[PDB]
């Protein structure tokens, strides 16, 4: 819509990266609270791309996670950072 | 040391919750950058309590994750929030 997608680190097909950005755009259009945004994104990837995804949405965080190959993306959408990854 | 541990949500034995707080205290004493803090905590729980843990450290984030029973803690230590959980 108005928000700039900047992908920072991805281990993920470009189709799926575009999905991630799409999902997060829909989440940001629907929700204002970071946990709700993360939930929307997580639930839709669990549906679309199989469980089990995990999503963190915020302006200030660092992380260290373990993900399945080809199932990791860390990106900005506007001023919010989104970590989305599959493990389990 | 000086930082106040405030546990917000836990699905975890009280022994392990104390370990989590201990680990994060050591991390904060050693590291200033959130990703490094998260890495220290993640790696030590992977060692002490078996893989696979995931750790997020920050002042602003929401999350939605899936964890194994009895292997979840979300807490503050000082002004930083720490999410630490096992999945995989």
């Amino acid at each position: 819509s108005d928000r700039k997608a900047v992908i920072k680190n991805a281990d993920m097909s470009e189709e799926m990266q575009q999905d991630a950005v799409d999902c997060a755009t829909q989440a940001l259009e629907k929700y204002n609270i970071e946990k709700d945004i993360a939930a929307y994104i997580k639930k839709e990837f669990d549906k679309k791309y199989n469980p089990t995804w995990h999503c963190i949405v915020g302006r200030n965080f660092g992380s260290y996670v373990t993900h399945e190959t080809r199932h990791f993306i860390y990106f900005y959408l506007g001023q919010v950072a989104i970590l989305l990854f599959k493990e389990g | 040391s000086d930082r106040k541990a405030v546990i917000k949500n836990a699905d975890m034995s009280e022994e392990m919750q104390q370990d989590a707080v201990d680990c994060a205290t050591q991390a904060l004493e050693k590291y200033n950058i959130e990703k490094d803090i998260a890495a220290y905590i993640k790696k030590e729980f992977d060692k002490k309590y078996n893989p696979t843990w995931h750790c997020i450290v920050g002042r602003n984030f929401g999350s939605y994750v899936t964890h194994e029973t009895r292997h979840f803690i979300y807490f503050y230590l000082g002004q930083v929030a720490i999410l630490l959980f096992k999945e995989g």
Binding site: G62, V65, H67 | K35, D36
Partner: peptide, 10 residues
């Protein structure tokens, strides 16, 4: 099958 990743906000 897996990798570990670190992320840090700007």
């Amino acid at each position: 099958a897996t990798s570990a990743k670190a992320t840090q906000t700007d």
